[PDB]
Amino acid sequence: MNIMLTGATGHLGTHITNQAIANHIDHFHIGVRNVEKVPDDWRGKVSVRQLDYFNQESMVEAFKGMDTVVFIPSIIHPSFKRIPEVENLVYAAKQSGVAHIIFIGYYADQHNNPFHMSPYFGYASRLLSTSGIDYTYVRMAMYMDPLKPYLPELMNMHKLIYPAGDGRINYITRNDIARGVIAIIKNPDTWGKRYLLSGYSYDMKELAAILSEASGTEIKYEPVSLETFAEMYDEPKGFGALLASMYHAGARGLLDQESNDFKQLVNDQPQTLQSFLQE
């Protein structure tokens, strides 16, 4: 069974690829926009194919002979600019006879979720449904990973300023999301179902406490306005409002989502934020 992982060199893709190599998964292929940008450590361990998300032809060719495609959305924004990649995914899958698609989606996708990328995720799930192709839709919670590099700034401000009100947000590490996806890949009896890979939920007060003990510095939750947040983090342009909208969704309580899918798939509990930061 030929597996094709797109966006393999991105953050999540790197975790999935390294785990697939470590587990010696057979017939594993990766797609990258420019083949020269493949880690030397992967050379000879995985099959490489050129694949550009915004070049329909490249995806049609990259999918030839593939049985299962694991698709990782890009970071392009806003939703209108990202939509073409999912259109290309479905077009290429149909053209090249792909039998199964594992789509990695984000959990901020409700009909009333204000996160700027929610339209893309709502559209993707539905487009897959209309395609007639078997698909496993894996929704993931918010990445824990970004918190580590953010510590320096947090310790400096001595304040957690996410405009998330009193909402509870569920977090999970990329490593764990990857463990779930690999488990799905290895067991076809899990295909065709909808999953939510969640870790643990924390309100911002509890988050600040976890960050405080981890950094040994005192960090208190003192949220700034949505406008102030967007304005001080608007880089690149338009990113500010988008990031703010994500926490705004949390304030509305739309990010307090949990399931035991991780445990049922990996037969283990997700790594806690304390363990992650301590690591």
Residues in contact with its own copies by the rule CB under 8 A: 79-80, 83, 87, 109-116, 118-120, 122-123, 125-127, 129-130, 132, 137, 194, 245
Distance between start and end Cα atoms, the chain: 36
Minimum distance, C-beta of residue 155 to its own copies, in the bound complex (Å): 32
- Count of residues that interact with Mg ion, criterion CB under 5 A: 3
Which CB sits closer to its own copies, 18 or 228? 228
Q: Which stretch binds Mg ion (CB under 5 A): 41-49, 84-92, 114-122, 129-137?
A: 129-137
Where do we find the tokens 């939509």? 83
Taking CB within 5 to 8 Å according to partner kind, which of Mg ion, its own copies, none is near residue 18? none
Rounded to whole angstroms, the Cα distance separating 276 from 174 reads 11
Cα angle 82, 145, 236; round to 5 = 45
Non-local (6+) Cβ contacts of 128 within 8 A are 86, 90, 101, 103, 135, 137
Rounded to whole angstroms, the Cα distance separating 59 from 43 reads 21
Which CB sits closer to its own copies, 10 or 78? 78
Which CB sits closer to its own copies, 122 or 165? 122
Minimum distance, C-beta of residue 153 to its own copies, in the bound complex (Å): 27
Does 33 engage in binding with Mg ion (CB under 5 A)? yes
The separation between CA 138 and the C-alpha centre of its own chain, rounded to angstroms, equals 9
Minimum distance, C-beta of residue 206 to its own copies, in the bound complex (Å): 27
Taking CB within 5 to 8 Å according to partner kind, which of its own copies, Mg ion, none is near residue 33? Mg ion
Total Cβ atoms within 10 A of residue 22: 10
Which CB sits closer to its own copies, 74 or 215? 74
The binding track of 201-240 with respect to Mg ion, each residue x by CB under 5 A or -, is ----------------------------------------
Rounded to whole angstroms, the Cα distance separating 167 from 249 reads 9
Nearest to 109 by CA among 68, 84, 134, 141: 141
Residues that bind Mg ion (CB under 5 A): 33-34, 134
